[PDB]
A paper describes a structure:
In the early stage of eukaryotic DNA replication, the template DNA is unwound by the MCM helicase, which is activated by forming a complex with the Cdc45 and [name] proteins. The [name] complex from Pyrococcus furiosus increases the cognate MCM helicase activity, in a similar manner to eukaryotic [name], in spite of the lack of a eukaryotic Cdc45 homolog. In this paper, we report the crystal structure of the α2β2 [name] tetramer from Thermococcus kodakaraensis (TkoGINS), which consists of the [name] and [name] subunits.
The crystal structure of TkoGINS was determined by the multiple isomorphous replacement method with anomalous dispersion (MIRAS), and the atomic model was refined at 2.65 Å. The crystal contains one pair of the [name] and [name] subunits in the asymmetric unit, and the protein forms the α2β2 tetramer generated by the crystallographic two-fold symmetry operation. [name] is composed of the larger α-helical domain at the N-terminus, and the smaller β-stranded domain at the C-terminus. [name] also possesses similar structural domains as in [name], but the order of the two domains in the sequence is permutated. The crystal structures of the TkoGINS tetramers revealed a stack of a two-fold symmetric dimer of the AB-type subunits (TkoGins51) onto another two-fold symmetric dimer of BA-type subunits (TkoGins23). The overall fold of each subunit and the tetrameric assembly of TkoGINS are essentially similar to those of human [name]. However, the locations of the C-terminal small domains are strikingly different between the two [name], thus resulting in the formation of different subunit contacts in the complexes. Thus, to determine whether the [name] B domain is required for the stable tetramer formation, we examined the oligomeric state of a TkoGINS truncation mutant, lacking the B domain of [name], by gel filtration. This truncation mutant forms a stable tetramer, establishing that the C-terminal B domain of [name] is not essential for stable tetramer formation. However, a tryptophan residue is notably conserved among TkoGins23 (Trp30) and human Psf2 (Trp47) and Psf3 (Trp71) in this area.
Residue numbers in the entry:
A (entry chain A): 1 to 113, 129 to 186
B (entry chain B): -6 to 93, 101 to 131, 134 to 164
Amino acid sequence: MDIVKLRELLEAELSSTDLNELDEDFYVEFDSLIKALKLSAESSRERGEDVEERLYLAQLKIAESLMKEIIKLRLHKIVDLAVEGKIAEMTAEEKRLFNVIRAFIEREELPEIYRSKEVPKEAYIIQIDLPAVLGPDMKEYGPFMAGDMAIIPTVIGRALVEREAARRVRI
Amino acid sequence: NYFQGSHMFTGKALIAVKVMKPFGDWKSGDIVLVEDWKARELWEAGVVEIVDETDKIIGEIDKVIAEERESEPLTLLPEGLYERAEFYAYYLENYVRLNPNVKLTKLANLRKKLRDLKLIRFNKILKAVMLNSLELLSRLAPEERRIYLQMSKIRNEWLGDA
């Protein structure tokens, strides 16, 4: 990981409204680059290279800056996914967060740092463009775009399946 | 006390710099191309000197501005035009504070020209939203791409039109 890669991923986050699919270790590798840029910088200040140091520091600020812009674009896309009930591949840290946004929306419990009503929902691939559908909970799902992965109540997903408009998936 | 960062160079543009001292494998007097951010850092510490490409840059924008005001579609911007204009603006800017005036007039022109170019293309994006489309993205700088994508999402959810 380096600033060149972060420059590419920022360009790619900006160029689509969809969450850019990243290497699972994106965040872990970012931290490394920064721990590595942090040691390399001390290891030059003391060693009296005002130049070699100035460069290690300037790269680090660029890294923090690129990251800031990338995470901002991604969080907003994640918020939209959590609100619209859609799915997309995202790092492990992002699923944790996505789960907290998702918890918040269905009024669950966000931590500090018939036999039951409960509407059963599963993941599906929407095959055609579909307008918002009304679930048994009176909550509406959609609209959806062909190609979207969504978590909707099985009662509706089932109807869409037998209708050739959706297909179950593995989230 | 407080260092006000200002515009930040991330390396999107390559700047021609003249080496003053033995840094790395570079000898002295020779001309090299570095990333804009590395250009400002080594310049600040007298390791290199900025090859004044303001002449070529100003006239470069003028050509693009001229092309826009001629045929409706948005045009492909030379690689890094925006970022390279920013750098010579930083160069002209901090040149008045060089280390031991015809320039401080050009600084104003480049700024007026860059501003002008972004507005003409912005205004064309606004109107393009009123008629998404992949083709157009392959013609916009990544930041303008973001804008077009956002404009259209707002527009489609309001109007719902084609």
